[PDB]
Amino acid sequence: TNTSIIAGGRYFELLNETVALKGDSVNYIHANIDLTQTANPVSLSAETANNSN
Amino acid sequence: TNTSIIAGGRYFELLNETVALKGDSVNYIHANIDLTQTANPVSLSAETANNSNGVDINNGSGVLKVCFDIVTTSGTGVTSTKPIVQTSTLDSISVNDMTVSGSIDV
Amino acid sequence: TIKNFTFFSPNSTEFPVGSNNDGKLYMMLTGMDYRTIRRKDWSSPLNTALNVQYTNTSIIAGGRYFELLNETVALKGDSVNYIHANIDLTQTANPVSLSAETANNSNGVDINNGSGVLKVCFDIVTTSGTGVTSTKPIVQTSTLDSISVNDMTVSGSIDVPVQTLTVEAGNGLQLQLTKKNNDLVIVRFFGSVSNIQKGWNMSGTWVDRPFRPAAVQSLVGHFAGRDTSFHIDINPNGSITWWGANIDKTPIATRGNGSYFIKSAW
Amino acid sequence: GVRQYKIHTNLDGTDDKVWDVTNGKVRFYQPSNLGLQSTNNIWQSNGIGVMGTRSITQPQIEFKLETFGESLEENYQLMKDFVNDILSKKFVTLEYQTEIFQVYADLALADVTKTEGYGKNGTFSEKITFDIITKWYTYENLTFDKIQNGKVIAGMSKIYGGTAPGNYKYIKGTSYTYYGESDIDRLSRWDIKEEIFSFMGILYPKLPKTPAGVRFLDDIGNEYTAIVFKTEQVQDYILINTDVNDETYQGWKGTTALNLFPVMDFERYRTRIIEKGQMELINLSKAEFKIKRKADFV
Amino acid sequence: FVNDILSKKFVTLEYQTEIFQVYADLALADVTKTEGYGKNGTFSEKITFDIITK
Amino acid sequence: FYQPSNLGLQSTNNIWQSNGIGVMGTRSITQPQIEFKLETFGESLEENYQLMKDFVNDILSKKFVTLEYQTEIFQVYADLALADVTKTEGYGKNGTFSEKITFDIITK
Amino acid sequence: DIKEEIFSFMGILYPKLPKTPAGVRFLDDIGNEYTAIVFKTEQVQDYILINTDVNDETYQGWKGTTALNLFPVMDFERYRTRIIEKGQMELINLSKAEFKIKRKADFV
Amino acid sequence: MLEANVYDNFNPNYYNISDFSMPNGKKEKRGLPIPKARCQVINYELWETGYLYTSSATLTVSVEVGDIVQILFPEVVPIEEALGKKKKLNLDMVYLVTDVDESNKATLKNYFWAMIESLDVPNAITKTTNFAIIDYLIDPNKNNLMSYGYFFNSSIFAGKATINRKAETSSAHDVAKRIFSKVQFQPTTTIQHAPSETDPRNLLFINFASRNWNRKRITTRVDIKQSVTMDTETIVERSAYNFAVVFVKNKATDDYTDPPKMYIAKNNGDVIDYSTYHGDGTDLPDVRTAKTLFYDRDDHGNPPELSTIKVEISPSTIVTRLIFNQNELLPLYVNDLVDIWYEGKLYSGYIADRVKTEFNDRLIFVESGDKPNVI
Amino acid sequence: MLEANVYDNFNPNYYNISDFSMPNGKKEKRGLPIPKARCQVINYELWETGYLYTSSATLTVSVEVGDIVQILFPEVVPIEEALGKKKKLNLDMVYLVTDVDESNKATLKNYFWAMIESLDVPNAITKTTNFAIIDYLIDPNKNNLMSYGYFFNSSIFAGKATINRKAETSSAHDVAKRIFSKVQFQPTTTIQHAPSETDPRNLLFINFASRNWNRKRITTRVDIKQSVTMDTETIVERSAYNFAVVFVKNKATDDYTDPPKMYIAKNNGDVIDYSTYHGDGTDLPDVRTAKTLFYDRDDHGNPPELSTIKVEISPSTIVTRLIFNQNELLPLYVNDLVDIWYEGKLYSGYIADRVKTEFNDRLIFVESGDKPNVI
């Protein structure tokens, strides 16, 4: 609903941002930063493991 | 409704299989195995006596008849049911614990 | 309808054998229910820290055969770990998995006729904070109907049926009969006897039919605090005959254990 | 050993606040009646009873509400927080636990008293009354999977084929495999043996351009009701909830929800009353249910 | 006890004395369940039956 | 004022049962009337009569009156309208009054 | 010979002749027929089962191992009442009938 | 508790088809089926004809609006349906279900009154005999409910029919009420299997029958012990008139622009122009019950015949109705012509209806008078 | 609690004067004023159209008989008032105060029904289209209450009008009821400011509107959880007929002296002379609902056209009404054409009314049928 995150020193806000989940699973919610995607550098994902890189 | 039977080492399932009974009688329910009837080798019958024949269907010809249930009727329906005992013929047994509900004949 | 399995399928389409059909067949051959297993360690499991490695163990659970070949189970420290085999038929590629749990959570789920995950405990592994301290297997139960056997060796115990009866035999005499296997009877004498003569039938209740012997049984008793004894005959007809000396108005406490067989050679 | 009561503000929700009303600072004592009433609309025709429809009535539950704060401030705070926590939700859930059961009742506050006749430290001794919504339930989680058997292959499958009396063989790596299972379909079905209040489920459709849902069959295998949909677009999954007070039929495509009710086969949805028999899937690969099991008396 | 009554359309009360052995087909009208226990948590409740065939 | 009859409330969700299963409707709150024990502490008959007369007519002179309810955790108000007041003769020391006053809730 | 009150009855009726109606008739104390439970089957049934209980009634014929619902073939004009009065019950084209009467006692 | 046969609506759209092959091969209308259910009836108030009130009962099987409910009684009624032929007819009460509440309490309308719902009768249908009206009224080609014939002695309906109020179009409900009051019979609905062995059908008939083919008035006595209810018809309900105010349409104005002429019924039945009365008043009814009549002139400008006016009025007073418990000393049945002595007074009229409850069996007697002419 | 705008009577004697100078100088009828008061409404039962019942409310300001009460709801309703133009219309319910008791409890009659009080309609007005009746009915030069126009799709009222019962003069109340049942729309009263910036007036309109300009039947399902009330129309109330008994005035007698001819509506909508039916009965309605019709012959002695008779009857049965709580899974609004699945049965008809209480919001569905012809 209103979550602020700092990842790699980059500040961004999640404002009514919905993440679809896998059923009967432990979902690891990730913030993904791709600076080449200039218009939308941040995206969220729900993954099967902690894939922090 | 769902009964599994092993007769002459042959496994089969009775799934909603109805047996018509004789009224005011003790009905001996038999599993009959005729290997020549390739499409339907097994059939059930309700008989006036235990007509189990001990026919060796795995070594020779013949129809194996083996009684597995005893169903007693009135003129209108079933009054009681008694199963045929399942015999385990063993030689030497090594066991840790045993519970007997009936009796041990020594 | 009749579904046949152990039979000739002339067109190789008639009687295919399903895994659940063989499961039920195997359960029936061995006399197992969904609350037990068949288990064999062909080689010893190996304990390393808080882990048990099943090197080569075969298990039959719900009539389903599988092998644990260098399969390690992580354990909880300072705990009694209950090792379970879990069967989920919907996981087609990997239907079996192992777990270490805080309690015996065997659920008896009928996987061969219905839906659900069968959980069956097969091992109990106790740990310290650093490793395995002891291992105890779960009992493999054989549920049988009528057995014909030549010889048997029992390492534990045989539990046979027990029936009890209290008889107020008359003249103050009380018999407490315990019958085991419907054959061996131990009679315990109680009460105090008075007003009886040798050869006389006692004035009270006759022995109930299920405790009557095939042949007359003479049971020796003793008089408490004395150096004197008596005997009574339990007759096949149920009656009890006094065979001690004549007893007057003063009752003397009667005690003692006597055994007899109900059945003769037949 | 002794019985335990708890008030949940949102049973099974991540935001659930639990008040231990057996051991906490706010306690419930002496439920008025955990029993029930029944009517069969019997008419006597000179003593001869003529039975009508049978109906159960669940009475309201009134409890003695006592506070155990160590000061006036704490006791005022406990009353205010407990009551407003109840008042802030559409309903609240009472957990009733003994050595033989752990059951729930969805309740709605009917009345609460507030007075001044204080014991030591300003403790409260009041009366709380609840209207019944769902009395005595448990949740049961069930998964249904549409699994298909393999094919029967002469030379691979366990079958006694070929020349009479038939055979199979053990051939390294190809040997014998089991074709499938008899009634593999049972793994996609709900075997209904008990009473329920309602159910909730996540349905995963299989084929596109084809209606999807679930059907219910009675003990003699005849369909008596079904919740089936025909959407214009493929949905990732469909969420259903037959709860009369939170009834939902919605399709999900990504993170977007759509009301699928206008697109249901109304003629097939004869009733919500689930009978003994079985539930089958309609064009679903999988379904995940959360069933609200029912017990009128416990 | 309660669920055994509740599982049938009706239940039958047998009333036996030295002079008669009679029956009554009954339907549960109400049953109470409270917490006011005696020794070992024994129940003392009220059960009412509607008459069908008395 | 002593012993408020009830500072609680009632609620309805218009629930009707379909064989024990509750079907919820609209939720509504009802605020009950507040009845208090009204006591005077005048040192004479004259003072007590004056107290009763002044208090009651001060309430009666307004469209409504406001009850302030203060504790260590809140300071709240209720707009009330007099529903009834008793006046009797059953005096304690110095002709003190012990009566009943009821208020209807406007804004609680 | 009906001298007492009855809640209901169960009967096994043995028909004689094929086409003619078969069942039972009830006569009052003045010898008049007021009601009758009668069936006109195409084939002679080995026996007919009747249960008159208001809450669980049944009218079933048996020929061999075949059960037949007799409701369609029952005389809906003659079955005037299930309230059996004092008088007598006669058989209609039956060789025999076996009844299990649920006797009525208002007080015991 | 009563037994009842429940049926699907007796829809004429369905049954009024002559495609049923009779045993002789000839084609007849489809007969009715067997009941769809047999249930019991409790907490009831059932009226035989529906003369005054609708009926109600709780049924043991769920019924719906449109169903037909035939309620059976383990009793008979004496009926003579032809000059020689006397029978003991089973008492049944046939209704249409008009409403069913949540508790399975049904509102029941007597078949005959339900059958003729929404049918209108122009005044022109009243031009000849009462039978012409009856035959117009009972017809499966027009009615909402099926029927297979009507039974009665021809004589009852052989007389001149009375006109509609204000010489206007009236409802079949109002004209039937009018005629039945005049002839002193109320209809009953019957379900029977065709008596001939040639006809296997289950049929429904409308009947105007009593214990005697040519009715014989019964003189009896009703006692205070019989829980007697005594009332008089409201002016809206007024079913008997002893005096008429007659308007005749003037040909020139084509309107009722001429003064009315008044006619009186004397105690003996004679009807005369009231302006010619020369008696002392002891031979005329003890109250006046006037009605206004409107007629047109024939093609010759003739006003109505005295014989046409005569049938509108009769020697009768304010109609008293007595509702009382059936008495075993002399049982009465619907359509009995009676002379009742109640509390020292004589009342002449007929039995219009009968009501059955779990605890009562009551008759409705209507003091219709018309003793000198009624048959 | 609801908000309400209270007004002095919308007296046509006052407002039906074209002396108001519009912004362009041209003269138009006087517009309505601003409310005389804004009050609140408590303890109410308010019906949108007044299809079956009158409304009541306690108002916070004293009102009097003749006042106009516009009750506002903080909700909208979807309406399409022209082929392309869709809007979300504020839900208001406009009434006339007919009674006020001592406690300020008002009895409220829906504006439209109050407007047409005491107006009569001779049968001659039914000679052409339904629109001819509507235009006669809604007129500030005749009505008791003011109005500034009526809105609807022409197609709804473009068909042949049905005749009055007994071919007589009927009240505007009865003819409007008849027409609305036939077209399956009930009127709504609206108060709005003239949409054009050229017109500053506050106006009142009568509307025959729904969510779609050319209605599309909605198929839905009503559940037992929705506190369903199920009833059938009483014979007095009967609004649908599937069969007709037709009388044609004979020229020589100038009276209905010839036998009637009967017409039936088949399930598919076809209407034929009933004497020509040659089917098995499975294609006809499962109950018969007959009505009597009366016509005159034209100047050539021609009886009515089948197309004139055809409009009186339709494929329909006994009209069931379902009153149920609004459902958020598929909300319904007044004038929706619907197919409702309730307890395993299909009911075809429309939403005739809607009721608002402090705790409920309910729809009245009328099983009008006529599925093959209704638009």
Side-chain angles (χ1 to χ4, degrees), chain D residues 174-189:
Chain D
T174 88
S175 168
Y176 96 69
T177 56
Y178 289 97
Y179 83 96
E181 302 236 332
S182 63
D183 194 25
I184 191 71
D185 214 63
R186 91 201 120 112
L187 305 176
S188 70
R189 293 201 312 260

Side-chain angles (χ1 to χ4, degrees), chain H residues 52-67:
Chain H
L52 237 35
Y53 310 108
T54 62
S55 315
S56 64
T58 294
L59 317 173
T60 59
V61 81
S62 66
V63 300
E64 73 189 279
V65 172
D67 289 349

Side-chain angles (χ1 to χ4, degrees), chain H residues 5-22:
Chain H
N5 297 332
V6 179
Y7 305 89
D8 282 322
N9 187 255
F10 291 165
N11 177 24
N13 286 352
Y14 190 79
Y15 298 103
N16 201 46
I17 300 176
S18 301
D19 71 343
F20 173 71
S21 247
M22 293 283 290

Side-chain angles (χ1 to χ4, degrees), chain D residues 37-88:
Chain D
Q37 294 93 61
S38 195
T39 194
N40 284 261
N41 296 289
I42 298 159
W43 180 266
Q44 280 176 44
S45 222
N46 180 53
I48 308 166
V50 183
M51 305 187 76
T53 103
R54 138 107 179 253
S55 193
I56 258 92
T57 288
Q58 294 286 10
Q60 293 182 317
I61 317 172
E62 186 187 301
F63 290 102
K64 274 192 172 69
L65 167 80
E66 274 189 29
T67 77
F68 306 81
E70 285 134 51
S71 61
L72 270 153
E73 166 160 0
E74 189 174 18
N75 283 304
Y76 273 125
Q77 195 71 72
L78 289 161
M79 261 304 264
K80 193 179 166 294
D81 292 357
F82 186 69
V83 178
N84 292 298
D85 275 4
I86 291 165
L87 290 178
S88 72

Side-chain angles (χ1 to χ4, degrees), chain C residues 84-102:
Chain C
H84 291 82
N86 309 294
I87 308 163
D88 185 353
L89 304 177
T90 69
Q91 295 307 98
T92 64
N94 302 280
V96 183
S97 63
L98 304 185
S99 60
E101 307 182 22
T102 62

Side-chain angles (χ1 to χ4, degrees), chain D residues 61-126:
Chain D
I61 317 172
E62 186 187 301
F63 290 102
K64 274 192 172 69
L65 167 80
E66 274 189 29
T67 77
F68 306 81
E70 285 134 51
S71 61
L72 270 153
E73 166 160 0
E74 189 174 18
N75 283 304
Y76 273 125
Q77 195 71 72
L78 289 161
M79 261 304 264
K80 193 179 166 294
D81 292 357
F82 186 69
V83 178
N84 292 298
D85 275 4
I86 291 165
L87 290 178
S88 72
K89 304 311 284 222
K90 184 184 191 182
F91 70 96
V92 115
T93 297
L94 174 79
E95 179 180 327
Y96 176 30
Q97 193 188 27
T98 65
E99 300 170 75
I100 65 148
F101 52 71
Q102 189 179 19
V103 305
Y104 305 90
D106 295 341
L107 304 176
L109 188 276
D111 55 65
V112 67
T113 68
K114 190 185 190 195
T115 66
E116 292 167 11
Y118 314 129
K120 67 174 220 149
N121 325 290
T123 58
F124 285 90
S125 202
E126 303 306 339

Side-chain angles (χ1 to χ4, degrees), chain C residues 5-10 12-22 24 26 64 89-90 92 111-115, chain D residues 143-145 147 152 154 158-167 176-184 186-189:
Chain C
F5 299 90
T6 336
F7 300 90
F8 181 29
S9 311
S12 303
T13 62
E14 307 85 340
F15 313 131
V17 4
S19 41
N20 60 324
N21 311 117
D22 265 1
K24 292 180 269 185
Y26 299 154
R64 312 303 189 97
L89 304 177
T90 69
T92 64
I111 58 161
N112 296 311
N113 288 307
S115 282
Chain D
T143 309
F144 317 107
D145 275 272
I147 316 293
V152 175
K158 192 183 201 172
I159 194 166
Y160 305 95
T163 56
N167 77 87
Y176 96 69
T177 56
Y178 289 97
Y179 83 96
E181 302 236 332
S182 63
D183 194 25
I184 191 71
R186 91 201 120 112
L187 305 176
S188 70
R189 293 201 312 260

Side-chain angles (χ1 to χ4, degrees), chain E residues 29-42:
Chain E
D30 57 72
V31 68
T32 67
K33 189 184 191 203
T34 63
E35 292 169 8
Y37 312 117
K39 271 180 180 75
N40 322 110
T42 58

